[PDB]
Symmetry: C2
Subunit: 139 residues, 2 copies
């Protein structure tokens, strides 16, 4: 259906529900993941310019959270809504700040700060929400 | 796919993820819901006569209410997508009379403003359903 403000908000709320749940409950599995460190590299190497690299590190990081659950139902539900997540993601001009947020999120994860990592994930997702709605209004 | 122990666990974990999220974030909307009190009535009726048709309906209505309270169409449709799977797992719950009792206490904690206790009771209920269904599955 139409990609209006409500559509965006629902997408982000769904992501918050699924990703926070997985990060909270599989925090240790995520923190000890070899993939997590691979992604850390992508997030650094990336120079402000290179979007393709941001979008790929972004997809990998958030899908990792979900995948860490080992729960095939949850994994496939997230896959079902990925194209919708990606469409919303296209309105995020501020995707260099997102990258910064991922850098800090991963750092809080690796340093054992679970509550801070959950806080940062929620903030990141709400920031994406705010940025995308802002941008949609201009068109 | 096969309904094995893992299938059941994944179902319950998915329900915990979605239902707790909705109960926590839309607690007030749920507590002030007219539907909630309608369902309370049904639950006092299952206590009277332990009829399965009536439990299953009150059970579906109560947990779908939590989800629906979000006003989030994506979340609502995702829950609908997995409902038949939830209902298949639910068929192995023989002691649904205890579930009904748990719903009675859950709704009371909701109506009495005890959010943390309501969330605790919902998680407990779902993990109890999990344990019961797996026990049952392994007798066949």
């Amino acid at each position: 259906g139409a990609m209006d403000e409500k559509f965006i908000r629902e997408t982000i709320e769904t992501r918050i529900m699924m990703e926070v749940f997985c990060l909270e409950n599989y925090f240790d599995k995520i923190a000890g993941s070899e993939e997590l460190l691979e992604i850390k590299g992508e997030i650094d190497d990336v120079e402000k310019s290179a979007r393709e690299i941001f979008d790929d590190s972004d997809e990998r990081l958030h899908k990792l959270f979900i995948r860490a659950s080992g729960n095939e139902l949850i994994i496939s539900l997230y896959e079902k809504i990925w194209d919708r997540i990606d469409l919303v993601r296209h309105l995020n001009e501020r995707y260099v700040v997102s990258n910064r947020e991922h850098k800090e999120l991963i750092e809080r994860i690796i340093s054992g700060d679970k509550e801070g990592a959950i806080e940062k994930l929620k903030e990141h997702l709400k920031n994406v929400e705010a940025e995308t709605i802002k941008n949609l209004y201009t068109y």
